[PDB]
Design a protein around this nucleic acid. Structure first.
Length: 52
RNA sequence: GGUGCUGGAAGGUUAAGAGGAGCGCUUAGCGUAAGCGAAGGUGCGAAUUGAAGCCCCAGUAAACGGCGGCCGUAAACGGUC
């Protein structure tokens, strides 16, 4: 439940995946569920499914 | 943003024209000496007023015109001028 930098409040959902070598940390905005940023950036070609 | 066009004087810059302070030049006369000098005439004219325009403020790009660089990351996103 993070306050935005402009003053209002918008809930953020942080996703932690622990899958060994496929582990990643991905933050979403919890309303549209688009990836704001990821700890490991993946391409549409390399790891085509679940592109970060 | 700059330049054109349109709109706006809050504030400065404002010309000619009004306005006349004051300062020189002459001398009727006061003066032992060198100077002071009223009324006129004759030049310089300071303050104060005195519009558009300029500085300024907004809009306008089928107006004039312009639409960038470096480093990463896989067009797109992040850091900086």
């Amino acid at each position: 439940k993070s306050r935005n930098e402009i003053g209002d409040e918008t809930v953020r959902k942080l996703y932690v995946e622990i899958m060994g070598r496929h582990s990643n940390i991905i933050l979403t905005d919890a309303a549209e569920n688009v990836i704001i940023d990821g700890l490991k950036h993946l391409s549409p070609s390399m790891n085509s499914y679940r592109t970060v």
